Amino acid sequence: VLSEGEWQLVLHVWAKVEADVAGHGQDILIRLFKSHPETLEKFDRFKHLKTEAEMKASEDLKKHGVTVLTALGAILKKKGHHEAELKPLAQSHATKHKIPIKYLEFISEAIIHVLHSRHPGNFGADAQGAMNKALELFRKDIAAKYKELGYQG
C-alpha cells in the first residue's frame, strides 16, 4: 500500500505526462525497444522497424504509445483500487500476447527513465521512489492474476 502522499507524488508527475501523451508514449516504447530489443519481437506490427529513425516515423507505434499510457494512467488514478481494470489487461497479455512479467519490469524502467529525463523538477528522489512503488504494486497484482489465469509469467 502507498500512502496518500506517495500517491500525490505519482499523480502530480502524471499530470505533466498528460500534457503530451503521444510524445511521452513514443519515447518510452523507443527506450524499451532499444534497451531490450528482444521485446520488439512480441510486436508483429513493429518487428520490422530497424532504426530509431524508423520507430520515430511510425504512426502505429505512436498510436500504441497512447494506448499504453492511457490504460496505465486510468490504473494509477484508482490509487490502488484497480482490480476491475487489471482483469481484462491481465487476460489479453497472459493469453493472447504472452508477455512475461520480466518485460513489465523492462517497460517500468523505461518509464522511470523518461520521467527523470523530461521532468526533473517534478521527479526528484522522493517522487521516483513513489513511482517505483506504484509500478511494483501494478506488476505484483498483474502477476497474481497471471497465475489465476493459468500463465507462468
Q: Judged by CB under 6 A, which of 80, 103, 128, 132 binds ligand HEM? A: 103
Q: Judged by CB under 6 A, which of 3, 20, 35, 45 binds ligand HEM? A: 45
Residue 115 to residue 118: CA distance in whole angstroms: 5
**42 Cβ partners below 8 Å, 6+ apart?**
97, 98, 99, 103
Residues in the chain, total:
153
| Greatest extent of the chain over all pairs of C-alpha atoms, in Å | 43
- Residue 116 annotated as binding? no
Residue among 6, 51, 34, 20 at smallest CA distance from 109 = 34
Tell the smallest beta-carbon distance from residue 1 to ligand HEM (Å): 20
Q: Is the Cβ of residue 20 or residue 41 nearer to ligand HEM in the bound state? A: 41
- Residue 97 annotated as binding? no
Task: Categorise residue 58: left if φ over 0, alpha if ψ from -120 to 50, beta otherwise.
Answer: beta
3 binds ligand HEM (CB under 6 A): no
The residues that touch Cl ion, with contacts defined as CB under 5 A, are 15, 48, 53, 56
The site for ligand HEM (CB under 6 A) is made up of 39, 42-43, 45, 64, 67-68, 71-72, 89, 92-93, 97, 99, 103-104, 107
Binding residues for heme b: 93
